[PDB]
Amino acid sequence: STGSATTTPIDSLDDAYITPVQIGTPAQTLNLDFDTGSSDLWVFSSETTASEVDGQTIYTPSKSTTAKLLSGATWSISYGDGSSSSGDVYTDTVSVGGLTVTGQAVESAKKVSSSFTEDSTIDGLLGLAFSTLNTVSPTQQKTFFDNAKASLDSPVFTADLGYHAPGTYNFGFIDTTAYTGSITYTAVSTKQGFWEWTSTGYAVGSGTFKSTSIDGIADTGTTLLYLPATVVSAYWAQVSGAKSSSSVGGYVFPCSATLPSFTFGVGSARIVIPGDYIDFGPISTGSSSCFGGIQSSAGIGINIFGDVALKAAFVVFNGATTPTLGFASK
Ligand SMILES: Nc1ccc(F)cn1
């Protein structure tokens, strides 16, 4: 089997991407944030604290004839941005663009943190990292990809995020028309539960490529590109007026700037992120100071190849016996 669904940026800045997901019987369509940096499929629901829902579409398990309460199961998760959610669990039929999983754990939110409430465009998350990170207790649950894997024509999913435009998530196949050149595969470590790999280096604009190992994760659920301070300082030193602002929480630059590109290495291959992809607009409404899309990972503990990097490439998340990651230009 295969699945194919369009992913859409939630706003004019590509702050996140939403993909419609069908849950239950009859189908209840919710727009979820496909996240390769987490492993829980959770949704806003009829059980979510009333004051914590503000415009989101909710899943109502009592209206689904295939929903079953997973007895005694609870979940609680915290993300890198300080956000969190928790609640109870149902098993139900979940479909993504024609691909169906019966008995998928659907984590119903009883509580969500302010950032989730404040974002009316995201109805929940669909985790695509390794099932070892799943927070369901006392019986850990599998991801949608992990449940569908054996049924897929090929044990893979692909992320093709658009810049200011819709893109696609495919399951079970590689669309050879969606990229240019060839796909370069690179080794993955699953020890931390992430699609963790090692970039072979970088370049800033038309500058010389620096061969240096950068361990990091391919994460569709993180908006920006988080890299070591030395690399990020080399990037922003090419932009007149750019500086690290402690009050803003990162590198800012004059909105009047035309940004240079950023290249990252995948083996001997090179992925070029165009400069416009690194512009995240005014720091506050009407400001002429803009927020940078490449930020330091110094406070995180890990480098993150978020949407800024992934949207420049066609990315293969290969769930073969030994998982690997594939990157191609597009
Ligand atoms: N880096 C993040 C932040 C929030 C979220 F829901 C997922 N990933």
Swiss-Prot record:
It catalyses: Hydrolysis of proteins with specificity similar to that of pepsin A, prefers hydrophobic residues at P1 and P1', but does not cleave 14-Ala-|-Leu-15 in the B chain of insulin or Z-Glu-Tyr. Clots milk. One of its GO terms (molecular function) is aspartic-type endopeptidase activity. Transmembrane segments: none annotated. Keywords: Aspartyl protease, Disulfide bond, Hydrolase, Protease, Signal, Zymogen. The active site is at residues 35, 199. Residues 17-328 form the Peptidase A1 domain. The keyword Signal applies. Its EC number is 3.4.23.22. It is an enzyme of class 3 (hydrolase). GO terms for biological process: proteolysis. The keyword Transmembrane does not apply. Disulfide bonds join 255-290. Belongs to the peptidase A1 family. This is Endothiapepsin. It comes from Cryphonectria parasitica (Chestnut blight fungus).
